[PDB]
Design a protein around this ligand. Structure first.
Ligand SMILES: *[C@@H]1O[C@H](CO)[C@@H](O[C@@H]2O[C@H](CO)[C@@H](O)[C@H](O)[C@H]2NC(C)=O)[C@H](O)[C@H]1NC(C)=O
Ligand SMILES: *[C@@H]1O[C@H](CO)[C@@H](O[C@@H]2O[C@H](CO)[C@@H](O)[C@H](O)[C@H]2NC(C)=O)[C@H](O)[C@H]1NC(C)=O
Ligand SMILES: *[C@@H]1O[C@H](CO)[C@@H](O[C@@H]2O[C@H](CO)[C@@H](O)[C@H](O)[C@H]2NC(C)=O)[C@H](O)[C@H]1NC(C)=O
Ligand SMILES: *[C@@H]1O[C@H](CO)[C@@H](O[C@@H]2O[C@H](CO)[C@@H](O)[C@H](O)[C@H]2NC(C)=O)[C@H](O)[C@H]1NC(C)=O
Ligand code: NAG
Ligand code: NAG
Ligand code: CA
Ligand code: CA
Lengths: 277, 277
């Protein structure tokens, strides 16, 4: 009775570990952009839920960076590529910038003019947790190169929920934090040496943070930080700013793709991860 | 009863498949040579046992390519690097060239001036199988660039036992074949587009054949053939030929290393493999 349970538990653990080890590597190439829709103002965000059961593919959409509390939900990708019909939901507080994420059926965003991370339910429409990001800048203090109140950037990867911000103690450099997806508590922090005001955008792939150089023109992935080894490396992986302005750029584990907001348009990039043995 | 046994069998199959998919990949670089021993004539063949019981790291040594029938049984690497004591075992027939292999508990070799593959026991000292390679050249008609009656090359990888030869029907190009480790029967054959007489050496990592361009001077991995997709590609992977003339270069999956014979010296290379996800 107990021996077979131990055997199946070991089997599940080994399957999970081996499939996670084969899941990702290091990025080496970014594909050409693919445009889905043209809507909204030049600044905004759009994403999908990674931990969603297959067959939902609900696209969440947000327009504006200063004063907005309306989020759009499209019931399918085909309902977002062509159909202009959506469901509008109202947030208790307006967000700042495009550094919001959707994960585990809830939206993580930043409160207006404050360093407060808020978890909001998109199904029950209620509030659970409103925590404070310890030692983080707000109100265009440590924004990206394009600005627009992007001081806090929330993302997810195969390991969980991460927040990229900057600390006055760490000059103005990029600081990575791993957050509990329930209590929004600090688990582990990595303090890098790349300034956030000269970044423009950043994303995380399964534990490695890739930081862009600029936002318009010759955009390229300039910086890489490995939190497991706590090391850094200057790369030169290039991509293409087709519409000459990038405001949001996030990595979505399930689709293994980079969702991007290109000058008021919704675009996708494809990553090329390699593993060395 | 049956359900848990089926679950255990599925767990074993998935573990084996996932560890084999995480094992090897496309070769990307070769490290500097490491010399272990200096003995014998300029041409010879030394190799280890991939599928061996733990605690049996016995190396196998052979000198000459024409009429020698004595093999050496240095029981340990420390007993081979420094100790000059060995056990000499006789063969029923002398070998041709430096292309032989030691797999599991037997040795596969070629029988004098014939296209005959012989399986010989290194413990019971008898013959179980002696077959003929179909349409394979012999007696210095489809040798390597260095000659020396290396018309048939035998190697092992994570998939099993492979033979590289050449066929009159396929001009003088390299032909790969998968052999049964027990019955020495042809399982599947692959046609490549690289002539064998201009090759010099070849080795298989896992289902991919890498072919060198020369034997003394500027040596590099020049050709690659994927038998799973049956596609060829010309690559440029230099490796350093420290001691001029090379005679044998084979791959060991257990150590994941290239064993080589460089002008009477025994050398080791540690390979680097990468996988794209
Ligand atoms: C995604 O959300 C579900 C639902 O909230 C999480 O399921 C919880 O799992 C924990 C432990 O596995 C249980 O203690 C909770 O009771 C579950 N929730 C409910 C409502 O039953 C799931 O863990 C979340 N995903 C991740 C990665 O945390
Ligand atoms: C966050 O980054 C800051 C910036 O360097 C780190 O602060 C330094 O920490 C070392 C050792 O802890 C001290 O010797 C320095 O005096 C600190 N500098 C300043 C300006 O206070 C901090 O350690 C980092 N946090 C973590 C968890 O690594
Ligand atoms: C390597 O050799 C061992 C034994 O020398 C092989 O083990 C045999 O396995 C089969 C089925 O798995 C049994 O029917 C035999 O009885 C085993 N041999 C002995 C002597 O007991 C092993 O299969 C060989 N490896 C490969 C890949 O074929
Ligand atoms: C390897 O190449 C040889 C020569 O190109 C092939 O032999 C020919 O096979 C075709 C069938 O596809 C016959 O029509 C020809 O008559 C054969 N040529 C000769 C000279 O006999 C051989 O079949 C190839 N092997 C494989 C596995 O594709
Ligand atoms: C690689 C490719 O040709 N297409 C991929 C595929 O995953 C899908 O069509 C799209 C949405 O996820 O992302 C991209
Ligand atoms: C190279 O491979 C050999 C094989 O045993 C061993 O010494 C070790 O794994 C490697 N040596 C290095 C990397 O110095
Ligand atoms: Ca981002
Ligand atoms: Ca060889």
């Amino acid at each position: 009775y107990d021996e077979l349970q131990s055997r199946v538990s070991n089997l599940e653990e080994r399957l999970r570990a081996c499939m996670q080890k084969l899941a990702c590597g290091k990025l080496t190439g970014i594909s050409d952009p693919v445009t889905v829709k043209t809507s909204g103002s030049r600044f905004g965000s759009w994403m999908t839920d990674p931990l969603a059961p297959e067959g939902d593919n609900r696209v969440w959409y947000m327009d504006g960076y200063h004063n907005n509390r309306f989020v759009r939900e499209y019931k399918s990708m085909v309902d977002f590529m062509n159909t202009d019909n959506f469901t509008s939901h109202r947030l208790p507080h307006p967000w700042s910038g495009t550094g919001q994420v959707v994960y585990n059926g809830s939206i993580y965003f930043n409160k207006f003019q404050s360093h407060i991370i808020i978890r909001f339910d998109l199904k029950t429409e209620t509030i659970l947790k409103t925590r404070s990001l310890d030692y983080a800048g707000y109100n265009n203090m440590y924004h990206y190169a394009w600005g627009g109140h992007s001081d806090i950037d929330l993302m997810v990867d195969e390991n969980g929920l991460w927040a990229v911000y900057a600390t006055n103690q760490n000059a103005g450099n990029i600081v990575i934090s791993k957050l509990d997806p329930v209590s929004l508590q600090i688990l582990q922090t990595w303090n890098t040496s790349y300034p956030k005001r000269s970044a423009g955008e950043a994303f995380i792939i399964c534990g490695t943070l890739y930081v862009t150089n600029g936002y318009s023109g010759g955009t390229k992935v300039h910086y890489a930080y490995q939190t497991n080894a706590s090391t850094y490396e200057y790369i030169d992986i290039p991509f293409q700013n087709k519409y000459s302005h990038i405001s949001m750029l996030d990595y979505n584990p399930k689709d293994r793709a980079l969702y991007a907001w290109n000058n008021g348009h919704q675009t996708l990039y494809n990553v090329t991860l390699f593993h060395v043995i």
